[PDB]
Amino acid sequence: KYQCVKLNDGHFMPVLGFGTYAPAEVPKSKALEAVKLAIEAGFHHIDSAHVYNNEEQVGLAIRSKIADGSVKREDIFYTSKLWSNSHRPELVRPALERSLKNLQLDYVDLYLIHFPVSVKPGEEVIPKDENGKILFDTVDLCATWEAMEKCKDAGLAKSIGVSNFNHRLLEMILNKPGLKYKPVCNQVECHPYFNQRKLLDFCKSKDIVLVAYSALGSHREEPWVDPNSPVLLEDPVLCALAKKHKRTPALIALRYQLQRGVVVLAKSYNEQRIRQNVQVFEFQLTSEEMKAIDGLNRNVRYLTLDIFAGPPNYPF
Ligand SMILES: NC(=O)c1ccc[n+]([C@@H]2O[C@H](COP(=O)([O-])OP(=O)(O)OC[C@H]3O[C@@H](n4cnc5c(N)ncnc54)[C@H](OP(=O)(O)O)[C@@H]3O)[C@@H](O)[C@H]2O)c1
Numbered sequence: 467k468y469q470c471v472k473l474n475d476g477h478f479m480p481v482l483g484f485g486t487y488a489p490a491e492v493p494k495s496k497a498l499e500a501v502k503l504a505i506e507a508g509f510h511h512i513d514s515a516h517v518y519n520n521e522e523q524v525g526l527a528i529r530s531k532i533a534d535g536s537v538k539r540e541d542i543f544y545t546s547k548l549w550s551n552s553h554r555p556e557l558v559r560p561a562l563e564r565s566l567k568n569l570q571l572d573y574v575d576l577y578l579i580h581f582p583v584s585v586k587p588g589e590e591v592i593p594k595d596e597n598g599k600i601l602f603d604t605v606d607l608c609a610t611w612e613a614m615e616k617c618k619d620a621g622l623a624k625s626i627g628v629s630n631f632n633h634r635l636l637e638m639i640l641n642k643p644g645l646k647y648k649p650v651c652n653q654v655e656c657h658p659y660f661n662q663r664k665l666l667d668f669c670k671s672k673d674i675v676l677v678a679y680s681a682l683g684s685h686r687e688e689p690w691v692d693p694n695s696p697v698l699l700e701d702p703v704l705c706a707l708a709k710k711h712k713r714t715p716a717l718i719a720l721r722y723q724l725q726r727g728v729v730v731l732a733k734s735y736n737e738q739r740i741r742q743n744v745q746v747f748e749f750q751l752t753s754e755e756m757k758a759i760d761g762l763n764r765n766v767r768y769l770t771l772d773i774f775a776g777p778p779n780y781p782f
């Protein structure tokens with residue numbers, strides 16, 4: 467057994483997920499090993515994406531752990547995401563089916579719209595013209611969502627959701643005429659420097675689960691993240707809570723999210739840290755500790771994806 471939350475479609479999501487993105491200077495081999503170690507440690511939820519360029523490796527890890535008897539397929543919650551070169555409705559199912567072929571899995575547990583700004587179709591994930599300009603595309607995300615619904619009805623995705631959506635974009639889906647399935651989740655950046663209280667409450671009001679990424683202050687990969695941003699885990703309040711509990715600041719940051727009703731991702735490719743992170747289930751924070759962490763909020767967004775700024779659907 468392991469801790470899960472019931473989604474608005476009746477499926478269950480494990481509340482601690484393993485993040486699989488690593489910057490390109492990290493060999494893809496490392497993904498295979500790290501996912502195996504995460505499953506061994508007790509992660510039951512694994513987060514990936516077509517754009518991470520690691521589905522072959524992540525899928526092999528999962529297949530391996532199934533085939534050697536370590537875990538059953540029903541005890542792994544696997545998430546993929548629809549990249550922005552496949553927003554057009556007729557391209558949605560093919561992108562899911564391409565991810566599934568790479569993974570050699572029959573279905574994903576969850577399929578998300580990765581990012582709300584669309585780019586032109588083709589193999590290239592960031593298509594550019596001759597002059598370096600991103601080739602943006604104009605697509606009705608409501609149409610994309612109907613295609614996602616169809617994938618759910620096909621059994622290719624058990625659940626569907628969104629990522630990096632703001633209030634306005636969530637509302638566009640929620641108010642869509644003929645809506646079949648609400649998003650089960652909105653996967654967004656969330657940590658004690660950017661605690662997303664407003665958007666969290668909105669999502670709660672609609673029984674949409676907020677899934678936190680960069681919960682430990684991000685990969686900090688350039689140019690995606692400003693190197694001059696503060697380092698979350700050096701925070702002196704987090705460090706003193708850690709000392710107090712004989713834990714680590716990472717574990718404090720993880721535990722904060724679980725208690726506020728957020729599902730939390732954590733990426734690590736380091737064996738010790740992977741094992742550490744599952745200790746989030748071993749302790750609890752008091753109401754005064756939770757309020758101390760709430761106090762850290764400082765409107766610091768690590769991940770702007772500002773190469774996609776300009777189009778109306780840019781969410782920040
Ligand atoms: N939907 C999206 O647009 C989106 C965006 C960003 C992230 N995500 C997802 O969310 C996941 C996590 O976000 P993130 O990759 O930005 O990273 P994160 O989980 O915030 O942090 C990863 C960093 O913290 C380190 N770390 C992990 N556990 C630690 C611990 N116990 N003590 C200290 N350091 C620790 C890791 O280094 P080591 O590997 O060396 O341990 C890594 O450098 C991604 O991998 C991806 O799955 C999604």
Ligand SMILES: CC(C)Cc1ccc([C@H](C)C(=O)O)cc1
Nearest residue numbers: 487515517518580591592769771
């Ligand atoms: C690095 C780039 C070529 C691909 C890419 C695009 C978007 C994302 C988002 C922000 C995420 O981290 O999930 C990651 C990687």
